[PDB]
Amino acid sequence: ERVVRDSLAALYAEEDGEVAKVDGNRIVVRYEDGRLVEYPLRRFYRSNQGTALDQRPRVVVGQRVRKGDLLADGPASENGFLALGQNVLVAIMPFDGY
Amino acid sequence: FGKRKGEGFGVDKREVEVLRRAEKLGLVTPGKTPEEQLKELFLQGKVVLYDGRTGEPIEGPIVVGQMFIMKLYHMVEDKMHARSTGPYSLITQQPLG
Amino acid sequence: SKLKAPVFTVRTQGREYGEFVLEPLERGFGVTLGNPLRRILLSSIPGTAVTSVYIEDVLHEFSTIPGVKEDVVEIILNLKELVVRFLNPSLQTVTLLLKAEGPKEVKARDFLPVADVEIMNPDLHIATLEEGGRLNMEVRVDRGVGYVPAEKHGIKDRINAIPVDAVFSPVRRVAFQVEDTRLGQRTDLDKLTLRIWTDGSVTPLEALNQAVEILREHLTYFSNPQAA
Amino acid sequence: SKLKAPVFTVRTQGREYGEFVLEPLERGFGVTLGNPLRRILLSSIPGTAVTSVYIEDVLHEFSTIPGVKEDVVEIILNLKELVVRFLNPSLQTVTLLLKAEGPKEVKARDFLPVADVEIMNPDLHIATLEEGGRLNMEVRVDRGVGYVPAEKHGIKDRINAIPVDAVFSPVRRVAFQVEDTRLGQRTDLDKLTLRIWTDGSVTPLEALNQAVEILREHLTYFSNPQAAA
Amino acid sequence: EAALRDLDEEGVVRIGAEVKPGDILVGRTSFKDVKDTSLRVPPGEGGIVVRTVRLRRGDPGVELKPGVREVVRVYVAQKRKLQVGDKLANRHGNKGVVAKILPVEDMPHLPDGTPVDVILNPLGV
Amino acid sequence: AEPGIDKLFGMVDSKYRLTVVVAKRAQQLLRHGFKNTVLEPEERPKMQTLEGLFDDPNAVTWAMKELLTGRLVFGENLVPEDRLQKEMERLYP
Amino acid sequence: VFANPDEALLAVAHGIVDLQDVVTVRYMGKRLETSPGRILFARIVAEAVEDEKVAWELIQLDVPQEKNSLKDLVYQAFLRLGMEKTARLLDALKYYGFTFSTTSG
């Protein structure tokens, strides 16, 4: 979680507030200050190495968000945790020389 | 195992054969019920496994579990390359790299 | 000392789970019967799958829709979990139409009814629409067998349609259990139990019957010896 | 779009060896057909075997016979390889009697003829008698399936009889191989090769046909659910 | 016209078109009375065209090199699935190339019917 | 392994001489369109395609088979090259 | 006590004995106190080299087959039979080794 947070890849709520608008390219949040803040989302962007880095919203309209709460997941992130691969069922055994 | 026992199933014959083999291998203690030996194998991280091609079990218990695995940036798609003829260099007149 | 014809027992749970017991069998015949049936059930049972998707104002899979939380890739991922039952054996392909406006939670039940077509998981979540968002979709569903990648079939009905990887198999899981039994004086006889989990499009009994028919047809092929 | 019916090819070496090729097949069907056929061929083909042996002046299988070079084990092992064919289906068990004396090479054909029974390998070597050696034996032959060890049945005509392991199976060995093959654009098809060694009483083709018929008869059992639990 | 289907009226491939090796992405002609010098997809590449960017002389903030009237860039996307020859690794230094993809019915499975997803050789430990 | 490779290796004093002989015989077969072969019509190397069995196009395989038959003579200074080629052309245009 | 290797391997196929059990088998006119697995290995070599006596001469029956014994077998097969038959033997060894490593557990 610290690795995900410190890379500035994901989006977190600046203050305590409530989510007003959610989209595949936009999140508009209404903070308790009364100020509307709109965060655009980076979508299908080419990295230096050709990989696609996009942010996907993880919040719903009307949801209450505290300070530091996750708003959108970055690339290789699952609910704010570093997600570099997949959890698979493995067996440790030889198999026909393959 | 309680899942299996609730549905009304006992120990498989193939599991009995594997338990005999593991008893010979020294992985379980002789004199216990098949469920106790199965639990001993499970506590060693090993389960009875069946071969999908034949349906017979693997002759010994096999380590099975969840593993975290990542795909690496080295992709065969970006590497496979072939040439018959093509561009040549200015001075040496030899194929480019 | 030949064995009497075994008894065959059927237990069913919904349209999705089935247990089929055959006992008593000779020693070793439990695996001999269970394994080929399991392989055929997991490999060769025909079913239905989503093969094509068209979305209005969408040009490719790598785009987003205004007013919709999920991108097209995630929408197609959700649509790949749709279970469609064809009530008619002759029916080969259908096109389901979806029209929705936000704010709402578009599920599989929001598809317009079609004759001789049923949706076995109407609660399956498809998309989330906010105020101002709209979703107009046309989903083409085909009959088939096996796993056919989108790059293989390449099915497009319109210019902007997106081909979808098709997983036609309706069977989700197959297990079989061989248990010890006896008959009078004989010992070490087999009792076979097949456990079949399907998606509800096809029942376990139907899948078992089709697997048995396929095995019988393949056994037929050993009937015409030819010289080498 | 289902694929054309496969081609079945045979290659027979006497009554003893056979190769059978089935191709092309759908992906994965090679082992799906090979494994059950191998199990049935090794386990369920009806046959005959020597099941018991009585020799006078012999108290157990670890004894010896004066006048005969071989010990009891060698005669029992030679009898294990005797191939006998029953001619009528009503016959179940047969006693074959062997009278021999004098310096001689006792072969299979020296057995006293019984009716509706045929020794397929009369040239098989049973024993060697020296001067002053005698051999009076009664071998009990039954019909069965598979392999049954002597201690499992333990059948004895009388108290001095020696039980013998019954190799009922007429099939001596089964091997099979699945190879990748292609037809047109498709490249994941299977070609299945089956090699069968029998003992000569049944040809490999007949054994394969019997195994296929057994599998079909077992598949017919999935039809009428008497029990509806 | 089979080679010019996906180009728009400005000579650039349209967004959403699928492109395969040999297909034209941007059309261009050079004074040879003109000859084909178009941009095509190199061998072993291609996919779906997702973006096009055009920069012309005079556009605010553009600093082209002298002599170049305009520049066109095309962004093409691919969805890559796991295939034979790809590299996988765990966090403990075990790395390997995928050598075989088996159907589900060939995989080893638990007695409850669940098949495994990956088979690792014990000789690496 | 190539069929009869042990015999071929035993037929010569040096393995490179075997390679040279095989290559030269393959060139001879290619030059005359396989009409100068010493193989009987049932020893010809075959190749299996969809239409049917045809002649093997690979001349090196033909050369090894011919060397196996033992009907070819090889050595140093057997015949002048020009006369050899002219005579070959005379028998096989 | 088995009359021939086929009977011993058939008994193995029926679960009577395992490949690692020591029994008595009659092979090549002799009574060998050996295991069905070693008999099977001998048969593998004999069928690979298409020669029963030479294969019997090449193999070391009374030891488990490991790296050094297999290397010595390959060298002796090369010397006695030639590289073509050595290649056949190597392919057979590879196939059977993979097959038995998969099911060994």
CATH class of E1-81: mainly beta
Q: Quick one: how many helices (H) and strands (E) in chain G?
A: 5, 2
Alpha-carbon torsion (G17, G20, G25, G29), positive or negative: positive
Q: Tokens 């019920």 — which residue? A: B33
Amino acid (1-letter code) at residue E35: K
Question: Is the same domain home to C36 and C56?
Answer: no
Please indicate if any CB of chain D lies within 8 Å of the CB of C11: yes
Residue A55 near residue A73, CB atoms below 8 Å: yes
HEC-encoded secondary structure of D108-144:
HHHCCCCCCEEECCCCCEEEEECCCCEEEEEEEEEEE
Does C131 map to a domain? yes
Distance between CA atoms of C164 and C139, rounded to whole angstroms? 10
Question: Is the same domain home to C100 and C61?
Answer: yes
Structure tokens at E62: 């553009």
Helix (H) / strand (E) containing F61 = helix F59-69
CB atoms within 10 A of CB D198: 27
Distance between CA atoms of C172 and C197, rounded to whole angstroms? 5
The residue of E97, E116, E125 whose CB has the most chain A CBs within 10 angstroms, and thus the best one to mutate to test that interface, is E116
The domain of D144 spans 47-168
Instruction: Indicate the residue among D168, D186, D209 that finishes a domain.
Output: D168
In chain F, what are the domain boundaries?
1-93
CB nearest G104 (choices: B17, B56, B60):
B60
Distance between CA atoms of D19 and D195, rounded to whole angstroms? 5
Distance between CA atoms of C96 and C111, rounded to whole angstroms? 7
Nearest-neighbour CA in chain B from G85: distance (Å): 31
Nearest-neighbour CA in chain D from E103: distance (Å): 8
Structure tokens at C103: 């704010």
Residues in chain B: 97
Please indicate if any CB of chain C lies within 8 Å of the CB of D159: no
Does C15 map to a domain? yes
Structure tokens at A38: 């709109």
Tell me which residue of E50, C64, B78, E18 sits closest to A46, measured CA to CA: E50
Structure tokens at C91: 């029916």
Q: Tokens 């039954």 — which residue? A: D142
Q: With CB atoms and an 8 Å threshold, state whether C195 touches E113.
A: yes
Helix (H) / strand (E) containing F48 = strand F46-48
Q: With CB atoms and an 8 Å threshold, state whether B68 touches A86.
A: yes
Amino acid (1-letter code) at residue G45: V
Q: Structure resolution in Å?
A: 2.4
Give the CATH number, domain containing residue C117: 2.170.120.12
Question: Is the same domain home to C175 and C161?
Answer: no
Q: With CB atoms and an 8 Å threshold, state whether G83 touches F5.
A: yes
CA G79 centroid distance within chain = 19
CA D112 centroid distance within chain = 23
Q: With CB atoms and an 8 Å threshold, state whether D172 touches G14.
A: no
Q: What domain count does chain D have?
A: 2
Structure tokens at D52: 């018991």
The residue of B48, B59, B64 whose CB has the most chain G CBs within 10 angstroms, and thus the best one to mutate to test that interface, is B59
Structure tokens at D223: 């039809």
Question: Is the same domain home to D51 and D155?
Answer: yes
Question: Is the same domain home to D204 and D115?
Answer: no
Structure tokens at C162: 């997106």
Q: With CB atoms and an 8 Å threshold, state whether D7 touches C227.
A: no
The domain of A37 spans 10-74
Does C227 map to a domain? no
CB nearest A89 (choices: E77, E99, E116):
E116
Q: Which overall architecture, per CATH, does domain F1-93 show?
A: Alpha-Beta Complex (3.90)
Instruction: Indicate the residue among C168, C191, C209 that finishes a domain.
Output: C168
Residue C20 near residue C33, CB atoms below 8 Å: no
- Per-residue DSSP letters for chain D? -PPPPPEEEEEEETTTEEEEEEEEE-TTHHHHHHHHHHHHHHHS-EEEEEEEEEETT--STT---TTBSS-HHHHHHHHHT--EEESSTT---EEEEEEEESSEEEEGGGSPP-TTEEES-TT-EEEEE-TT-EEEEEEEEEEEESEE-HHHH---SSTT-EE--EE--SEEEEEEEEEEEEETTEEEEEEEEEEEEE-SSS-HHHHHHHHHHHHHHHHTTSS--SB--
Give the CATH number, domain containing residue C18: 3.30.1360.10
- Residues of chain C in contact with residue E15, where contact means CB-CB under 8 angstroms, are 59-60
Distance between CA atoms of A30 and A25, rounded to whole angstroms? 17
Amino acid (1-letter code) at residue C126: I
Question: Is the same domain home to C173 and C207?
Answer: yes
Nearest-neighbour CA in chain A from G96: distance (Å): 9
Distances (CA, A) of D39 to B48, C43, D12, D220: 22, 22, 21, 18
Neighbours of D, requiring at least 3 CB pairs below 8 Å, are: B, C, E, G
Does C59 map to a domain? yes
CB nearest C67 (choices: A23, A43, A54):
A23
- Residues of chain F in contact with residue G87, where contact means CB-CB under 8 angstroms, are 1
Distance between CA atoms of C90 and C115, rounded to whole angstroms? 13
Tell me which residue of E41, E53, E42 sits closest to E12, measured CA to CA: E53
Q: With CB atoms and an 8 Å threshold, state whether C60 touches E112.
A: no
Question: Is the same domain home to D51 and D163?
Answer: yes
Structure tokens at G49: 């080299």
First-to-final CA distance of chain A: 37
According to DSSP, the β-strands at A86-92 and E118-120 are parallel
Does C52 map to a domain? yes
Q: With CB atoms and an 8 Å threshold, state whether C69 touches A43.
A: no
Tell me which residue of C131, D12, C8 sits closest to A61, measured CA to CA: C131
Question: Is the same domain home to C58 and C164?
Answer: yes
Q: With CB atoms and an 8 Å threshold, state whether B54 touches C39.
A: no
Distances (CA, A) of G88 to G44, G74, G81, G95: 11, 11, 11, 11
- Residues of chain B in contact with residue C38, where contact means CB-CB under 8 angstroms, are 55
Q: With CB atoms and an 8 Å threshold, state whether B67 touches E115.
A: no
Cis peptide before A57 (omega within 30 of 0): no
Question: Is the same domain home to C33 and C60?
Answer: no
CB nearest A61 (choices: C64, C74, C103):
C103
Read off φ and ψ for residue C147, nearest 5 degrees: -115, 115
Q: Quick one: how many helices (H) and strands (E) in chain B?
A: 3, 2
Helix or strand or coil: residue A22? strand
Distance between CA atoms of F7 and A15, rounded to whole angstroms? 87
CB atoms within 10 A of CB C77: 12
Residue C163 near residue C155, CB atoms below 8 Å: yes
Range G66-75, long-range pairs (CB < 8 A, 24+ positions): G73/G45
Structure tokens at C15: 């349209």
Q: With CB atoms and an 8 Å threshold, state whether G14 touches D147.
A: yes
Q: With CB atoms and an 8 Å threshold, state whether A90 touches E114.
A: no
Question: Is the same domain home to C30 and C84?
Answer: no
Question: Is the same domain home to D51 and D164?
Answer: yes
Residue C124 near residue C80, CB atoms below 8 Å: no
Does C58 map to a domain? yes
Amino acid (1-letter code) at residue C134: R
Helix or strand or coil: residue E50? strand
Question: Is the same domain home to C65 and C163?
Answer: yes
Nearest-neighbour CA in chain C from A24: distance (Å): 5
* Spatial strand order in the sheet of D171-183: D7-13, D17-25, D186-198, D171-183
Distances (CA, A) of G45 to B56, D31, D137, D195, G30: 27, 25, 39, 18, 18
Which stretches does DSSP call E strand in C43-129? 47-55, 84-86, 93-101, 104-107, 117-119, 125-129
- Residues of chain B in contact with residue E20, where contact means CB-CB under 8 angstroms, are none
Please indicate if any CB of chain A lies within 8 Å of the CB of B58: yes
Neighbours of E, requiring at least 3 CB pairs below 8 Å, are: A, B, C, D
Residue G1 near residue G23, CB atoms below 8 Å: yes
Please indicate if any CB of chain E lies within 8 Å of the CB of B80: yes
Residues in chain G: 105
